[PDB]
Design a binder for this molecule. Structure first.
Ligand SMILES: Cc1ccc(C(=O)Nc2cc(C(F)(F)F)cc(C(F)(F)F)c2)cc1Nc1nc(-c2cccnc2)nc2c1cnn2C
Length: 271
């Protein structure tokens, strides 16, 4: 990671909550997002992992401020924010081609992480940021690791929490997290994109989802979804992780559909 010095940094507004919008001087200045004792340890820790990543579809770490207070993790800024909220907002305005391009981008980033032997564990549209060019980039806001136990509790959460509706069965039952379980999660993300941000298994409780998945049921087709796209998510949801596509097969399959777009034709796109 690169140590940024606080003079090139200007916080401006609180985006969420802390994560600010700011400006980073590079001459020209660029806009950035700024995230600000066990909590301090993990904070600087996560930056070290981010700094190892450099890919078009992975949130880019500009640097960190670890020698001054406030301590800061600085990334590029993603104007359009989190993909799930963004799709619920643009419900219907994108073609299948544009939606499958976002999925391609997401899979490209996930192929890069798998090549690094990095297992995400929380691949979900809420962790995908979007910029003014509709480029999608994998991120991790850390909600899986938010500590809500009492500081004197007899029993504490170990292993963090899992996103039950996004997590492969083997990872739920045996904590076997691999790129293959990320691929399952990627399938859920395809369904999220294609439904413009619907809640997976919206009619079911959490326990009913685990019971549904073990009975062989999966998310239903999205409306207006081309068959090839729904086929691919179904492949992502095979129960035996070894039969799922690799993130390389995925990027490849999406590339073939995009280059032969008649396979992405859905009547709603007809004019
Ligand atoms: C400043 C910052 C710091 C950290 C991360 C991040 O991705 N951490 C991360 C990623 C990975 C990995 F694998 F994906 F690369 C692995 C890990 C692990 F696991 F190691 F910890 C951690 C993201 C940002 N920036 C944003 N975040 C938010 C935001 C909004 C509400 C709540 N939280 C965050 N909004 C933003 C931006 C940019 N624009 N906007 C509108």
């Amino acid at each position: 990671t690169t140590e940024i010095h606080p003079s090139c940094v200007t916080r401006q507004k609180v985006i969420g909550a802390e994560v600010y919008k700011g400006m980073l001087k590079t001459k020209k200045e660029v806009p950035v997002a700024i995230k600000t004792e066990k909590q301090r340890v993990d904070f600087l820790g996560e930056a070290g992992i981010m700094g190892q990543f450099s890919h078009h579809n992975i949130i880019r770490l500009e640097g960190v401020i670890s020698k001054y207070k406030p301590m800061m993790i600085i990334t590029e800024y993603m104007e359009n924010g989190a993909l799930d909220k963004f799709l619920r907002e643009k419900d219907g305005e994108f073609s299948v081609l544009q939606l499958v391009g976002m999925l391609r981008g997401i899979a490209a980033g996930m192929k890069y992480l798998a090549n690094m032997n990095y297992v995400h564990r929380d691949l979900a549209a809420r962790n995908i940021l979007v910029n003014s060019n509709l480029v999608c980039k994998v991120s991790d806001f850390g909600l899986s690791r938010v500590l809500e136990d009492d500081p004197e509790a007899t029993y504490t959460t170990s292993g963090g929490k899992i996103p039950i509706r996004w997590t492969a069965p083997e990872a739920i039952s045996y904590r076997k997290f691999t790129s293959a379980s990320d691929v399952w999660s990627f399938g859920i993300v395809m369904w999220e994109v294609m439904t413009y941000g619907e809640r997976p298994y919206w009619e079911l409780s959490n326990h009913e989802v685990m019971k549904a998945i073990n009975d062989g049921f999966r998310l239903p087709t999205p409306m207006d979804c081309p068959s090839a796209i729904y086929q691919l998510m179904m492949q992502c949801w095979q129960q035996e992780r070894a039969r799922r596509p690799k993130f390389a097969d995925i990027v490849s399959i999406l590339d073939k559909l995009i280059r032969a777009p008649d396979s992405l034709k859905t009547l709603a796109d007809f004019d």
